[PDB]
């Protein structure tokens, strides 16, 4: 956890509703986590204030960042943005997004999913929906998302 002040060259957020970039959620547990993060925010973002909240899942670690952006023309020494699995993003060649951090940098890792409000509040045999154990990360290529 680092507050916005700690980040060098940072900004102050406004009251606009941000837009969500929930990236790389494939597992049903990951879909549940993505939906749980999605319901916390309003569905319609105020696009006048270009503010983006990013929750990017990589190898079970959810990196949370918050930026403000601007769609600018590329400086003539910048390269065109490379697309995923194939270069030359079609349509935005020469157009690039400038980003400035306005929010905290944090890292999350889903540890437990419970039916009710914590362990005291979940009652039946379906009390805990999911529990993280270290033995599930015994292999470095096994991810729960």
């Amino acid at each position: 956890y680092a507050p916005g002040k700690a980040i060098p060259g940072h900004g102050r957020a406004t009251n606009h509703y941000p837009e969500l970039l929930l990236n790389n959620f494939k597992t049903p547990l990951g879909l549940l986590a993505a939906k749980s993060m999605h319901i916390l925010f309003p569905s319609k973002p105020e696009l006048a204030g270009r503010q983006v909240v990013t929750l990017h899942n990589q190898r079970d670690y959810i990196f949370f960042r918050r930026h403000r952006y601007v769609f600018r023309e590329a400086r003539p020494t910048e390269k065109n943005v490379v697309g995923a699995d194939g270069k030359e993003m079609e349509g935005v060649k020469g157009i690039r997004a400038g980003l400035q951090e306005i929010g905290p940098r944090m890292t999350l890792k889903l540890r437990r999913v419970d039916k009710g409000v914590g362990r005291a509040g979940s009652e039946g045999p379906d009390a805990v929906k999911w529990e993280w154990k270290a033995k599930m990360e015994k292999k470095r290529t096994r991810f729960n998302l």
Partner: protein, 154 residues
Amino acid sequence: VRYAATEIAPTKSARARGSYLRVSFKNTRETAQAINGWKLQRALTFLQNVIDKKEAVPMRRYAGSTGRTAQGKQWGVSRARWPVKSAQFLIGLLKNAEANADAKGLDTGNLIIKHIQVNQAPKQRRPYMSNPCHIELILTEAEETVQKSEAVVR
């Protein structure tokens, strides 16, 4: 509590290292201190104009009275010297960091030398002792500024 100033993103920086390099530690340290904080192309031109003789390197801490010319007027130091080999090693590490930034996907026209550190390497056991060094430089991109949007009313 107090939170330390977090590091810049690894997608916005490029690091180069050189270890157990056979150049003098003091001259390399002074050369690295001269180019510290500059833009990348300016440092390229300065080191290439100190490899072939036009421009001077001032010495402040490890300063030996060798030359006193007008080339130290721009630095305010009356003692100025021209190390050559340290310039070649710094040039090699600078193009190494340029290749690293090009491979990573950074704009190479807005690269600035965030930090350059010269540490002492183990001494060469041959009473005459050699003084090798380690060099660790980190280039970053120029800080980008985004214009805000006006707040909405409620």
